[PDB]
């Protein structure tokens, strides 16, 4: 991802989120490649706008790994994604779609 600086204070910062949502729609594939890198921006968003939820979520873990029989195993630990992880077993946890 070309990195975004946004700190998500003003409500207008939601624009960056939208720029990602639109990217998810128009280009689901390329979004899938850069999605951890966008998860890093989203986490700055969620930590501001939803600190309690961000607390519980990050407490579950920032990533996960699918195992045999397909069950997710979340990291239990917050840490920044690197594209070095794209080729690794790990997935960004924001996209797990796990309630």
């Amino acid at each position: 991802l070309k990195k975004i600086a946004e700190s998500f204070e003003d409500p207008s910062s939601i624009v960056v989120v939208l720029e990602f949502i639109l990217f998810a729609l128009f280009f689901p594939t390329e979004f899938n490649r850069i999605k951890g890198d966008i998860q890093n921006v989203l986490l700055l968003f969620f930590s501001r706008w939803y600190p309690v939820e961000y607390g519980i979520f990050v407490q579950r873990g920032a990533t996960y790994t699918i195992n045999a029989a397909g069950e997710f195993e979340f990291s239990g630990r917050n840490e920044k994604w690197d594209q070095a992880l794209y080729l690794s077993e790990h997935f960004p946890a924001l996209f797990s779609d796990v309630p």
Binding site: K3, A5, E6, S7, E9, D10
Partner: peptide, 11 residues
């Protein structure tokens, strides 16, 4: 490097 200034000083 790219340097990115904070958007608002008061933030």
């Amino acid at each position: 490097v790219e340097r990115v200034n904070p958007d608002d000083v008061r933030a």
